[PDB]
Every structure is written in C-alpha cells, then in structure tokens.
Amino acid sequence: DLGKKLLEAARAGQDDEVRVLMANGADVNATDASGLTPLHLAATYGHLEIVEVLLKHGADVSASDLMGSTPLHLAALIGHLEIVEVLLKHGADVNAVDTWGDTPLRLAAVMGHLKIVEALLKHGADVNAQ
Amino acid sequence: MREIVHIQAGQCGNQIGAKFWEVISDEHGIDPTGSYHGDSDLQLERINVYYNEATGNKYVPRAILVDLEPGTMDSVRSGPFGQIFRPDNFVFGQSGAGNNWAKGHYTEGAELVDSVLDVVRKESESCDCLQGFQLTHSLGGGTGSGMGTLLISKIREEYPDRIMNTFSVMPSPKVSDTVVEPYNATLSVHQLVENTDETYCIDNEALYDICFRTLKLTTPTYGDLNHLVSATMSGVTTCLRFPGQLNADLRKLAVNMVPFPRLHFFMPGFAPLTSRALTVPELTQQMFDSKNMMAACDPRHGRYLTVAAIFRGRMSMKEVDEQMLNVQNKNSSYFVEWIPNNVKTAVCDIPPRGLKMSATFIGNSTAIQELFKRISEQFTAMFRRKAFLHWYTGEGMDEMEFTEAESNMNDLVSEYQQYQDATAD
Amino acid sequence: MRECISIHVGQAGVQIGNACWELYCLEHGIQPDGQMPDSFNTFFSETGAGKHVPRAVFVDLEPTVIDEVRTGTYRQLFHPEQLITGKEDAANNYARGHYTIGKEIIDLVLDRIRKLADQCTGLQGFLVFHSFGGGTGSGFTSLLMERLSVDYGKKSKLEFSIYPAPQVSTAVVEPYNSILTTHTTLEHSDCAFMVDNEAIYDICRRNLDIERPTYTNLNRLISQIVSSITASLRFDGALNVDLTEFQTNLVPYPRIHFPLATYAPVISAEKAYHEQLSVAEITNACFEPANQMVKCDPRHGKYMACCLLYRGDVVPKDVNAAIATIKTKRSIQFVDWCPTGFKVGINYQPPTVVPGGDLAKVQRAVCMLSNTTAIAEAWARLDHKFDLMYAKRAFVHWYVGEGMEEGEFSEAREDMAALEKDYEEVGV
Ligand SMILES: Nc1nc2c(ncn2[C@@H]2O[C@H](COP(=O)(O)OP(=O)(O)OP(=O)(O)O)[C@@H](O)[C@H]2O)c(=O)[nH]1
Ligand SMILES: COc1cc2c(c(OC)c1OC)-c1ccc(OC)c(=O)cc1[C@@H](NC(C)=O)CC2
Ligand SMILES: Nc1nc2c(ncn2[C@@H]2O[C@H](COP(=O)(O)OP(=O)(O)O)[C@@H](O)[C@H]2O)c(=O)[nH]1
Ligand SMILES: [Mg+2]
C-alpha cells in the first residue's frame, strides 16, 4: 500500500523515498487510522524539504486529524519555525481550533517557542479568541 | 561516622557533581591530588562525611560517576579535579540514552545498573555508619532521569533504612535540549515522589531567570547556570560538612523539613546573587525574595510548611535572630500557622569562596505546585497529540505508564493546594 | 550507704550531667582524676586507691557528645563502661529512640546499670537526666524508665527534664516527643523536675547579662539548681534525706508529680561589689516569677506542697521570720486538703560555683520546691503545639515508619488531657 509507505517515509524523513512513491501514484493526502496525513507527520518531525514537496503536489495545508490537529498546530507544538513559516505562506488557518480548544499560538506559548509565538501573531493569530 | 555516598548520573548529573566537588574541595582545603593544604582544623573535622581517607594523609571523594554516554568519562577526567576521583568508581556505558527516559530506565540503563550497584555496595560496606545517598541528575534527559530513577528504586530496596536525597534539575524551554523533556521529567517526578526522602528542586527556568536579571544573559552557558547550582549545593550541605552549634545529619533534616511523605520537594535559595559586604537585614530580605529562588515559583502565591536558613561568615548572631523573627512577624500570612516555629536558622563561621557573608535558603513551600503545574501542562500538550510516543513504546513502555505519571503529578499539585488552603482550626 | 545512681540520656542529659558532676566534685573536694586530699558516698563509690568514682551512667544513640567526655577534663573521673554510645541517633524521632534504635542498646545499658547496682548495699533509686525534645532524650528515656520499673520494682525514680523553648535550639517535632515521653513515663516516675529552657535563657540574659547564652552558660546555671535539690542526698541533712522523701514531701497526688523549682540569688561574677543579700531578700525572691525554672503564673494556681532549701550562712530564726512575712504580705493559696506549712532545710556550707564562671560566689542561696497547679500552664503550651500539628497529622509518618502505631499519638494526647483535668480539679 503506497499510502502507508508515504506516511512512513514522511515521518522518517526519507526525502528520496517520498519523491519515488509520489511518482508511483501514492496518495499525497492519505491518512493513517487516527487521521494523520504525510504533511501532519513531516510537520511534527521537522522534515522541511518533505513539507515543501508535499505542498507543491496537492497536500491540504489545513487538514484535520480525528482530534482537530492541523499541521500548523503540530509544527507550533514541536517548535519547527521554518515549517511554521512555510505552512503560513501556503495558507494554513492560523486560528484553527482542535478538540481541546487549542490553537497553534496556545501550543507554541505552552512549549516556550517564542519565535513561533511572534511569527503566529504577525500572521494574524487571535490571542483573546479561540 | 555519618558518611554520605555521592552518585552523579548523566551529562547534567556529572557536570553539576564535578562543580560540587571542586567547590567543596576548595572549602575543605583538598587539592586535585587529594592532599590537604588549609589553615583550619574545622576544615578536616567532618571531612569523613564526603571523603574517604586514603594512604599517606590523602582524601578521596566518596563519589560514583555514572553515564550511558562514554564521552562523559573523558570530560570529567579532564576537569580541574578530574584526577581526584577513584578510577574504579567511573561506571560508563557506550551507546547513550538519546534523551529517552525509557532507554535509561528499561534498556541501556537496565544493562549497566548492576555494575553501578556493585560500586555503591563497595562504598556503602566500607562506611562506619552510612547516613545515606546524595544523587545529582537532570530530569529532562535519558540517563540522569531514566537510569537515575532506576538506580534510586534499586538502592531503596537494598538500603531501605538509609536516606535518599536528590539534587534534581528541572527542565525549561528557556534552556532546552529537546521537546521530550516534559515526558522525561513527568516519568521521573512519579519515581521521586515514591522513592526519595528529600529532593532539592534545581529549576533551569529559575537559573535562566537569575542569569538574565543579574548578568543580562539571554544566552547563558551551562557554566553560568552551574555557578548558581554549586553555590546552592555548598550552602545546603554546610551543616553536614562543618562543625558548629548544630548536631545533625540528613535524617534529622528530613524529619523536621517534611511534614507529609510525598511533599519533600524543596525550593532552594541563595544570597547574595553574585557572578563568576551585605548587611544581615539585606541578606535576610534577599533570601526570602522570589528573585533569589532556584525554583521558578512565587513564594507569595503559597505558604511555607517549613523553612531552613543557613548563614555563613562572621556576623551578629543576635541580628540574624531578630531579622529571622521579623520576617515571620511582619509576614505571618506566608507561613502555615499549624506548624509552630517552622522557620529554623543555623549559623556557620566559615563563609564560601570570594564572599564575606552568605545565606542559603531551604523552603518546603506549597508554591512549588507552580513548577509541577508548568511541567504537567507541557506534558499534557505533548501527550494529547502522542508526539514522539513511539520512542518510549519502542523500548517496551505502555501508554498507561504515561497516563499514570500524569495523574500522580496532578495528585501532587492538588495535595500542595490542600495544605495551602488549610486553616489552623 | 543509701546509694543513688544518676542516668544521663541523650545530648541534653549528658551535657547537664557534665556540669552537675563538675560542681559535685568542687563541692566535695574531689579532683577531676577522682582523688581527694563520707556523706557524698551516696553519689560516689571509692576504689582501693582512694579514687572517688561517680555512680553515673551516660547514654547516647550517637557518639559525638560522649566522645567529648571520654577525651575532656573529666576523662579519668568516670570508668569507660559507664559511657555508652550507639552509632546512629534517633534523628529527633521519639519512635527511633523508643522502638527501632533503642531496642538495640537497651539490654547493654541495663547490664551496665546492673554492674553499678551490684556495688550498692542500699540502692535508693535513680536520678534520670534527659530532654523532652530529643529523639533519644524522649524515646530512649521512656523505654529505660519502663525497663527499670520491671527490674527494680521498689526503687524510686526521679527526673530532671529539659522542657523545650523556641529561643533555645528547639526542633519542629519537639512538642510531639515531649507529649510522647510524658505519657509513657508518667506511671514510672515518682517525681520530675522540669527545666524550661526559656526560663534558664531569661535568667542568663537578665541576671548574667549574657545576650546569647551558650549551652555551657545554661548548663552551669541548671547544675547550680540541680545541686541545690540533690545536696540533701549528698550531705545528710534533715529534709529530703532519701529519694522516697521527695515523693512524701512534694507529691500528695501521684500523677501531679511536677514541682516548680525557684532559685535565688543569680548574680553576675563580672558586676560591681554589692552588699550581700539577707535571708529575707533571698526568700522574697522565691516568690518572684522571674526566678522560676519553668515559666508559669503561680498566682493563677494553688499550692499542694512547699519546701525551702537554704545553703550557706543561714540562721534558722531568720528563715522563720522571713516565712512569717511571706504569709502576711503575699497571697499564697494552698489547696483545702493540704497542711499549708513550708518545710525547711539548711545546709551550712558556703554555696559553690565554677571558678572563672559567670555566676558570682554568694554568702547564702535558696531553692524553693513548690508543687503548684500553675505548672499545668507549661503542659497547656506543649499540648496546644501538639494539637496544631496533630490535627493535620503533620510529621506523623516519621514515627509510624519507625515501629510506632498512629494510635499511640491519640492515647498519649488523651492522657495529657486527663492530666490537665487532674490539675484543674485540684486547682478548685
Ligand atoms: N539546657 C540544655 N538544653 C539542651 C542541651 N542540649 C540540647 N538541649 C535541648 O534538648 C533538645 C534537643 O534534644 P537532645 O537532647 O539534644 O537530643 P537527643 O536526646 O540526643 O536525641 P536525638 O539527637 O534526637 O537522637 C532541645 O530542646 C535542646 O534545646 C544542653 O546542653 N542544655
Ligand atoms: C544538616 O543540616 C540541617 C539539619 C537540620 C536542620 C537544618 O536547618 C537549620 C539543617 O541545615 C540545613 C533543621 C531544619 C528545620 C527545622 O524546622 C523547619 C528544625 O526544626 C530543625 C533543624 C535542626 N535543628 C535545629 C535546632 O536547628 C536539625 C535538622
Ligand atoms: N543546569 C544544568 N542543566 C543541564 C546541564 N547539562 C544538561 N542540563 C539539562 O539537563 C537536561 C538534559 O539532560 P542531560 O543531563 O543532558 O541528559 P542525560 O545525559 O541523558 O541524563 C536538559 O533539561 C538540560 O537543560 C548542566 O550542566 N547544568
Ligand atoms: Mg542527639
């Protein structure tokens, strides 16, 4: 299954495997059992080149898993600044609210990712409203 | 003879442990070869508490050096006091723990644990009368956190009648090596609550804040943070190491400082806050100030269950007494009314290096819940999204272990709140 | 012969013991090696060489304090077998002193006591020196008192107990240890002299002008008072000649066995030449609360018994005239079932002080021993501190982890509540 293979490659940061699987018809928007897509996984695990490659070939920038987590929530939680900037530039919903009522700004602030807090606020993150 | 066995585990544990040895060796007049060269008999009176007597009037730290990362052996051995340590007391692995609590606690650490215990046993059996154990480690990594807590639980089963004391370094995003630090620290706190008699909470968040406030550092080195840790470690062990009015060991300290078994997490403090002479009222005010605490909690948000204060140097002992009682009378609301005379002061004639007067604070405060709340909130943010969970489950851990550690830390927070709101009915 | 064995338990017991034996030696003319260039044979045994050996036992659960005795000025006064030490102390925990740590040394301590008892031909009993606050002073003393009541059933047991004070190095758990030891010792003690560290601290500051008194300053004052109480046992007078008489003269109700000691005069050695105080002046000072060994208000209480023990240049008719004035000018209320009279003892030797010490040598001194209901105020102070902590079970885990049942705290407190009531019932 090409979908499962691309999810694994995006998580593991296998740049060459990602490109090879996509050339074979792999679903860029495939989901695992929890609703995580290759973009969610590349954004969580800091694979910038894969994040960029997925976005160039139809990945949904604001896809939600079963818990309402978007790739931006995950990049902000883990503290991947360059990934946060790339997602925002590609139209990620800065004010996306997950099942716990958290926004990317709230996660970046809880984890002490000050540069991401700044970047989110600059791209219209609403602090007083979730 | 009141001997203490010192253990240092992981990168942070060995770095702060080496600095403790360099600082206390200077106070006791012990050079890196183990030779004494001081001018006072008071320096050697209680030398046996931390040092073994070696051949030809030499002193050797009763210290065990542990790490899963081999490179730690080298860095300690290359330090100014590197040669003072017994070579067979270095117990080192080759693969590392990769900042993973599960690797330290169940995999690599479980494989090295017996070798450490053999060294602990050899040191313990040679003691005339073992007081207990002192462990230095961080809670944010893999070795100090995972293997350190595994070592504590094994020591607790082998030496149940001996005190277990830790100097535990709390992680902060302001000083962070990885985002898995909240998982590693939560899993460790759970173990510390159950298996240690008394823990000094050395909070990296507070160390960063002190360095920013005092030296305007936005980018401190571990050296900058460690200067505060070593000053504190020297101060809190003063009455164990030096002769004076106080006839007391670690158990007597635990008895009077710990009213509830789980609430054994101390907020250390230090004055004056220097860099790499104050009056008695100035030392006293500074010692009780939020800006001087080594745990990032506001004392004003809670109540002190118990307080110990150690003044060092030549000063008016009458002035110290008046100043200490004044703090309690003017600020009665910050001390629980249901533990009478819960603020204790000791004075030691010998000041630390490069200082004429100093004061060390040891607080058992309900405000420490702020530190546990901070870690818990970061743990929860990470755990809800299951980020990096396979690192732990891949070592055989179950997700229930995470849920259980989460609940126990939240139970600890609620216990502190219960005593903060308690009235002297 | 009528021998008395002194037992010093824990740091406070041992250190006060050091000060007492130093003063006894000076009073009886015995050198620190035991040689002398006898009524005192009640407290000192004599070898074939003429060496005078104290009938004393020193016990501690850790060795530091007793090691100072073993190497100090009086290292040749006591025999090594009389100085017993453990390796690990009781860490301010009554339960360690009584149960876990104390059980390991009790048999050895009793064996050593038995060796001294074998040297006696008419053993009167024991004088037990200890703190209320220490884990050893509290816990080990109560275990030893329990074992001595079984092994020496007919023997009298008196205590000199160091009552805790915040001004004098107390610890947070000391109110617990005080109540725990009081409960378990109550039925095993015939008479107990409480020494409140705050009263001694106050006297040293006010009368000796010592801003921050050391244990040496406090203990030299305590030994001066203890010597005044035991003089009758060492000089063969007419009042309190045997241990049994202390109970007969001061204790009409067995549980209410805590007499208030009041001492005068306490004069600084480093103060300008003053006209010596008369019998009337030192007697008047016995009713001054500032001179008491225990802080309490005797005007709030009632007297059950009263003994006046004079030493030095004291004429009996001058004492009788002083007492007559006291029954007039002052309001001394006795309980309706007690004789109302004051028992008088006079020892004619000039009072003795440590040479170079803080206390000035006086021509005449007096210790008044009064059994007053006012001393219940000292029990109420301890009970209040106990209550605050116990309501939250603060520190209780330390005791439970050291061979003690939690229920023992409740049983001890209930006994203290009954004791406070005993005082209240007599006080009306
Ligand atoms: N007056 C007086 N009080 C003392 C002396 N030493 C200790 N104390 C008091 O005794 C109490 C502490 O008890 P200690 O006797 O020192 O302790 P311990 O009996 O040896 O027992 P542990 O150390 O707990 O095993 C406190 O209230 C002290 O102020 C002394 O030499 N004189
Ligand atoms: C070995 O070092 C220490 C050991 C202890 C104490 C202490 O603080 C002054 C120490 O220095 C840090 C101590 C602490 C707190 C107390 O009350 C909160 C107390 O009652 C009592 C104490 C100590 N006792 C006294 C009279 O200070 C005994 C235990
Ligand atoms: N204060 C202080 N913190 C340190 C030091 N070295 C590492 N840390 C902290 O310790 C945590 C990482 O654990 P570490 O000890 O390096 O890993 P281990 O070797 O697996 O135990 C993080 O919170 C670091 O900030 C040090 O020398 N001092
Ligand atoms: Mg002691």
Residue numbers in the entry:
A (entry chain F): 13 to 142
B (entry chain B): 1 to 42, 45 to 278, 285 to 360, 369 to 441
C (entry chain A): 1 to 37, 47 to 437
Task: Provide the authors' own sentences about this structure as they appear in the paper.
Fitting the data with a quadratic equation (Equation 1, see “Methods”) yielded the value of KD and indicated a change by two orders of magnitude of this value to less than 1 nM in the case of A-C2, down from ~125 nM in the case of D1, the latter value being in excellent agreement with the one determined previously by fluorescence anisotropy. Therefore, we also determined the structure of the evolved DARPin A-C2 in complex with tubulin. The comparison of this structure with that of tubulin-D1 indicated that the structure of the complex did not change much with respect to the DARPin considered (root mean square deviation (r.m.s.d.) between tubulin−D1 and tubulin−A-C2: 0.62 Å (967 Cαs compared)). However, in contrast to the structure of isolated TM-3, an ordered C-cap would generate only few clashes with symmetry-related molecules in the tubulin−A-C2 crystal; these clashes could be avoided by a different side chain rotamer of two residues. Taken together, these results indicate that a destabilized C-cap is a characteristic of the evolved DARPins that contributes to the higher affinity for tubulin. Remarkably, because the C-cap interacts with tubulin in tubulin−D1, the total surface buried at the tubulin−DARPin interface calculated from the structures went from ~1825 Å2 in the D1 complex down to ~1260 Å2 in the case of the A-C2 complex. Therefore, going from tubulin−D1 to tubulin−A-C2, an order-to-disorder transition led to a gain in affinity associated with a ~30% decrease of the buried surface area.
We previously selected artificial binders to the αβ tubulin heterodimer (tubulin) from a library of designed ankyrin repeat proteins (DARPins). Here we applied cycles of randomization alternately with selection steps in order to identify higher affinity binders. This strategy led to evolved DARPins that bind tubulin two orders of magnitude stronger than the parental one, resulting in complexes with subnanomolar dissociation constant. Biochemical and structural characterizations demonstrated that the affinity increase is coupled with the destabilization of the ankyrin C-terminal capping motif (C-cap) of the DARPin, which in the parent DARPin interacts with tubulin but needs to undergo a rotation to avoid a clash.
